[PDB]
């Protein structure tokens, strides 16, 4: 549900990459994410499902792949014990 992002430096640079783009799919983020840093793609799997769950990116599910919208930007990186 809606959680202030409760962010690792590792999440943190997929958020970073994510906010240069309006929003990015699935394919380009796991592109994108393993060419800055090698990472399994079940990492990015990983992060984005966090995100997801704690409300931070909210997503669009293009039929195959699914687009990530920022749902905080304002809040850039904020842990408080909520």
């Not at 399994?40 to 499902?49: A, E, G, N, R, W």
Request: glycine letters at 2%; proline letters at 4%.
């Amino acid at each position: 549900m809606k959680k202030i992002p409760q962010i690792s430096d590792a999440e943190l640079e997929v958020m970073k990459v994510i906010w240069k783009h309006s929003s990015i799919n699935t394919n380009e983020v796991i592109k994108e994410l393993s060419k800055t840093s090698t990472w399994s793609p079940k990492t990015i799997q990983t992060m984005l499902l966090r995100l997801i769950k704690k409300g931070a990116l909210n997503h669009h599910k293009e039929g195959r792949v699914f687009v990530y919208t920022p749902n905080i930007d304002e809040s850039d990186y904020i842990e408080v014990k909520s």
